[PDB]
Design a protein around this ligand. Structure first.
Ligand SMILES: O=C(O)[C@H]1O[C@H](O)[C@H](O)[C@@H](O)[C@@H]1O
Ligand SMILES: O=C(O)[C@H]1O[C@H](O)[C@H](O)[C@@H](O)[C@@H]1O
Ligand SMILES: O=C(O)[C@H]1O[C@H](O)[C@H](O)[C@@H](O)[C@@H]1O
Ligand SMILES: [Cl-]
Ligand SMILES: [Cl-]
Ligand SMILES: [Cl-]
Lengths: 579, 579, 579
């Protein structure tokens, strides 16, 4: 039922591959012609063997889809598809009596209803966060039937809502995993430095099962730490360990082998330690002023531009950002798969991690808030031990209103209640308060630790020359973070630096925009939009966009555009200046 | 803006062919990222010639679609597509000063918004009824730009609603026509027999313009009819002509040339005359008891199964119905294109004409009712002079409730207020009030002239044996009309007569069902479901259905299944019996 | 083995529908990796039930194709496909002992190899002619397996060769039929007027079976003919019957019910009678000088532009030619399906019937000649009783050489040896012997009864003005027949009459070309190219051609272009002038 920390380190079995599927736009498999649920629906996964009876479906002889994956890139007919697709898997598993078995979904966009052997396990909303079901006592001998009804229709009340600038990728987009656990298991745990304290590790551990009062030992061998505690009746224990670990940095992304062992379970992890705070306009990593030499990244694969999910995908994207000279990636606009965050952690990239509270969210809808806050809780719960994450982002480009401010205030408060260490950001927007004078006067800023905002001077707001004349001012002394900037270009399409969508315009733009950045007071980070061209249904210039947002510094085919090297050169200079 | 009678006989020019198009799932061409309408959207049809400015679209270099047509069968990517597609046409027209010009859409499913030269002409809802705009004063010299935003998203409040058993065919599905008119023109007229009177032609004529009081002459030369009247101050005149026309029958579908001439306009038509009434359980055409030897038909083309629109399409479908032995076709579940109705009239098929008040309509929604009634008015308005139509149908398979009954009673009253002659029906459903006793108890029946209903004994309700043993009773003495019956089969798929979806099962079903029909007291008509296999997203048996309803007596490739000849045999016997 | 006359009138059973298929571009199902045939190939149709053994295919779970049909329009992946596709059908048939069973293929393009129950029946080359196999003693109880290996790769030595201006439509393109016969049956027969003799019917009859010496009776009841003869030991009889039938004309396409009955078989037919000859520059139908008001037609369906095969397809196309005012159709460039020829015969269209000896045929290859002459024999054998055919065409636009002349001479001689009545044509080409002077000086002309040739003055040869100035002369006094002329236009695409591919240019072209035709000495027929836009892989103008030859007077969507009415008007004038 609840989230499981560090799924990859458990006894895991993959259900991935190719599953039988039924595309069901009118939801015939769920509703009868009176629009009422009915028992003989597709959840029952009845193979149509006896043709003397009538039924209107058969998984057994239908078409396959790859799992994990978006469905959109797998069939021309599903490119634009918004609606229901049924997924069906048969599997066997031999579970020794007394052991427990969980079914974990890395992500399904957007609504998933799950059945096992004809019985509903439950439902999930939110297309970028994991969820589990315990199947211990539902598992049968021999063949088991797993049915997933996946629907990605856009809903006004959803998070995100009916408008966004990326593709509506439906399906079982991340791996499906069977996790076996002992009868009482270590479900969740936290191990990080105390706030602003290079010399104190703090943490807690949470057991689940009938035997919740046990002795726990936290072992960090390289630190000669061997801390032993006893959980309470609720299965919980906290600890404080005087220690002086080598601190994680993008240059030296030191991780420690951490082993937790209770009487009935054991799990190993790789966890780094670092302090993060602001001081005036400075961001201080481990007490050292740093610049966030960043780049933004959508969860989309090189070359074929589907939903990313594997370590291969992550390593390819992050190696491009490595070459670009980054020490920071903004993972937009939703939690990415865990492989991406772990590979950023191993390679040395600080991370901004975000939930899709994006554009015109229904600020007055209480179910909508519940959804937003659950995604926030799940985002932090999964990755709270990833030291490379330093910013949680609660929103992106949301319009100003009283109800919106209340909504986002409650998320910021919840985030701080869950995590006292990391910084709280959100992509705000700029305003030209007087001709030639740009600022950010969003009341949300008072709730953030940084003045983080998107700006497109020279692309949406003027031609590139405007970068050469505008000036910036800010009314609070917090570090300034430009979470998006840039412009579009098609790789291989050349012309005058005045002609939009050529490589030469995007190059000229970045030269003048970089020079403008150098004069923005308090600037401490930049994550230009974006590393790689990505799919968007709002980009309709034929032979230029072709359903791609072209603001990548790398094409969707991994080709470095001229502008790539402008930013690379600046990042090489900032690397030396901040040594 | 108002409807125009007999468009095909006016001075017309076609705008059909291939138009430039933009698929726009998130409606970027209409709403900005704050979800607000914006100027600079795609309705302005700005060719992206000047690449020093930023634009996100270009009709001029985008892809084509055929007009008329559904979009679904034109590209694999559009097979399931529900959403917006923009259509764009450039055209020139030389309009003499003083003449008027109208833009007529035969049909656009579902919502159409139309601009000419960047100016919004208006908006239409309902995918099967025509609509017009006057463009007299908006036409420019040189190139004119016509832009249509077409959206087929399913809406709960729409007519039809979010569930139906046929394909959601979006696009400009029927021809687009420019109509030139004199400054004052004959917009509408009615010429038919008075109710139950073979010896009296009644009618009226309605002018539109500034010179509305004129002498009008009604000319039927074959009948030596020359009737002069003068319109009143509203452009309106009625008439009553004693005459004894040769009456239209299926066997002799006699049509007269009718010529209307006012002082400022002239239009010619082909119109037949017939009486129609019920008497007890009898249906009397021209005072002769008849049986409606019928077949149902969707508006879908032979072979490639797109939206039908041409006289070619109509002639092919109706020639199959001719071979089947029919004197009657039920055109379901919405107004068909006028070519279909005209070819039925010329070839000799009585017609049932229906609006898509189908399944779970939102009976409580006043906008839903106004939409339903507007489609009802438009259906009758276009075809009120087609004497082969004898039944208007206001509903199909709608759940019983008090509010549903008031909704449909208001439609029935409106239909009778518009047409005192034709019968009013609706597809009701049957009940098994006790084992082996079937009936129709629907209180809607009190408002209809016939006990019209769908029944699927032998397919959805029991195996074919059940036709052998059930009995039927009715609580009132109106003619009984079975508007649907039958079962599915794939042509070329053979096996035991017990095996569903084989030709042998469908054949055995029809043999036993026909014998059951012979004992239904008061049966006066049948329109089995259905002439031709058609597209439906609720039909998922792979290699058997493949997104087609397989209940056709003819395959979608024009092949007569075995059960075709069972109904043909019965119809030949009925033809002799009713001689 | 041999051809069967009048297949439709026999005891027939259709195997059409949807068959299992395997696309096999490298012919893995026929050749092993040493490029040698092997026994376990796909002809064996072994369902892959036992997965403890290895095989590389399974028809049972593979994809379907419609039969009859081209494969190209059925799947995007098969649009351009040239190569092998395997087709598989299971069927049962109960054959009473002593009866015979034949398997008839209307057409398969290009090479077909056929197996029944794992045994090779044989092979066929030629994509437009029928072929049969006797399966009497190969049929098994229960399920029978029919496998067809279809390959449409272009071969240099083939007929047609590697270049042609129409789509390479592969597959089982016409119906597949089981024909049951008595032990001795009437296989072939001929019944027509004697050459140039309105008062003498001549014919013959040919039996097949162990009982070949029988009494035969030819019955034409409406003529009060009841001719009885006795076949010889080879099963053959000839006859001459003094009679004066009403003669077939396009205006009154009179057909007689003809019944042939032997001791052991009987078959009915509908056969018309007419004389056809040339006299100087006149073509004389039934001794009356006629003009061939013609239009050319490819075997391609309205709307979706696949391979045509049904009576519906034929009626739609011929109704367009009816409206155009034609009394003649050129069926190019190969024998069309029998339905097309029979519907032309019923509706009143004279026919030119052709074999695909087209462009750069391998004149020196003796196998190539054998192929050409077999197609000629099969073309004449099927349709020798269709009085509406008056011209057999042996070639189209073939380059001049000694070997080509020998090749075509032998075909012309063979045609005359098979049919002494009909005219022999071939599409030759024009030459500009001096500026402004056009002629046809092809030595092939001496072997033809008409000076039949293609010309494209105003499209390929000059702009439309050239029609206004060139002059024509011919050195023999035979009737002149222009078998192709015209130009391309996209329906709905308008502009100046000077702009090619607009409707206005094609209209202006036809106005000036029609005027030129009126001054061509000896002109007796025209079949402009072409009735309907058709698929060609040599037409690459985007948004204009899009893989369609646009020389239709009707679009592929059945829309009459402006030029349609220019030719219609001329044909209406010729109808009056030749009364
Ligand atoms: O217009 C763009 O390119 C971008 O605008 C916004 O900044 C948004 O946050 C991005 O998601 C989007 O891609
Ligand atoms: O189930 C079916 O086939 C049919 O059921 C209903 O009777 C309905 O009116 C049809 O539109 C539908 O196709
Ligand atoms: O160029 C064309 O349009 C045509 O040229 C030749 O006349 C040929 O016979 C046609 O098959 C072809 O379509
Ligand atoms: Cl872009
Ligand atoms: Cl069905
Ligand atoms: Cl062309």
């Amino acid at each position: 039922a609840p989230q499981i920390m560090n799924v990859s380190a458990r006894q895991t079995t993959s259900l991935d591959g190719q599953w039988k599927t039924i595309v069901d736009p009118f939801e015939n498999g769920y509703y009868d012609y009176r629009l009422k649920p009915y028992d003989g629906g597709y959840a029952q996964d009845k193979t149509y063997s006896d043709k003397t009876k009538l039924q209107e479906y058969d998984f057994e002889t239908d078409k396959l889809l790859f799992v994990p994956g978006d469905w959109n890139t797998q069939r021309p007919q599903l490119y634009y598809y918004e609606g229901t697709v049924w997924y069906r898997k048969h599997f066997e598993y031999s579970l020794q009596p007394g052991k427990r078995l969980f079914l974990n979904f890395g992500a399904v966009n957007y609504e998933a209803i799950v059945w096992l052997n004809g019985k509903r396990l439950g439902r999930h909303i939110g297309g970028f966060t994991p969820f589990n079901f315990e199947i211990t006592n539902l598992l049968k001998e021999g063949t088991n039937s797993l049915v997933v009804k996946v629907d990605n229709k856009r809903l006004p009340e959803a998070v995100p809502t009916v408008n966004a600038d990326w593709w509506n990728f439906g399906g079982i987009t991340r791996p499906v995993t069977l996790i076996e656990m002992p009868a009482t298991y270590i479900r969740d745990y936290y191990v990080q430095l105390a706030k602003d304290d290079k010399n104190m590790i703090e943490g807690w551990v949470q057991l689940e099962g009938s035997d919740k009062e046990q002795k726990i030992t936290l072992d960090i061998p390289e630190l000669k730490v061997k801390k032993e505690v006893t959980t309470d009746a609720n299965g919980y224990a906290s600890f404080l360990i005087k220690s002086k670990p080598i601190l994680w940095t993008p240059e030296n992304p030191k991780l420690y082998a951490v082993n937790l062992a209770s009487e009935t379970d054991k799990v190993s992890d790789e966890i780094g330690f670092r302090t993060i705070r602001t001081e005036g306009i400075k961001i201080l990593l481990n007490d050292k002023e740093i610049f966030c030499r960043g780049i933004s990244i959508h969860e989309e694969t090189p070359y074929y531009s589907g939903r990313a999910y594997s370590k291969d995908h992550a390593h390819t994207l992050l190696s491009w950002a490595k070459e670009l000279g980054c020490n920071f990636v903004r993972l937009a606009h939703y939690p990415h798969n865990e492989e991406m965050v772990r590979e950023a952690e191993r390679m040395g990239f600080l991370v901004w991690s975000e939930i899709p509270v994006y554009w015109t969210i229904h600020w007055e809808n209480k179910d909508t808030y519940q959804n937003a806050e659950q995604q926030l809780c799940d985002m932090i719960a999964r990755d709270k031990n990833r030291c490379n994450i330093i910013i949680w982002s609660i929103a992106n480009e949301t319009p100003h209103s009283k109800t919106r401010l209340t909504f986002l205030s409650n998320l910021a408060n919840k985030a701080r209640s869950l995590d006292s260490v990391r910084l709280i950001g959100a992509a705000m927007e700029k305003e030209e308060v007087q001709p030639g004078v740009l600022t950010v006067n969003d009341p949300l800023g008072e709730l953030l630790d940084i003045i983080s905002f998107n700006e497109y001077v020279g692309w949406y707001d003027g031609d590139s020359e405007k970068c050469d004349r505008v000036n910036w001012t800010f009314d609070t002394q917090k570090p300034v973070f430009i979470s998006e900037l840039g412009g579009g270009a098609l790789y291989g399409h050349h012309g005058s630096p005045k002609e939009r969508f050529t490589e030469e315009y995007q190059e000229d733009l970045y030269i003048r925009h970089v020079n403008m950045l150098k004069r923005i007071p308090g600037l401490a980070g930049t994550t230009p939009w974006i590393l790689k061209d990505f799919r968007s249904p709002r980009r309709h210039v034929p032979e230029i966009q072709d359903d791609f947002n072209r603001k990548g510094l790398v094409s969707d085919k991994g080709q470095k555009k001229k502008a790539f090297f402008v930013l690379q050169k600046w990042y090489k200079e900032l690397t030396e200046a901040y040594k």
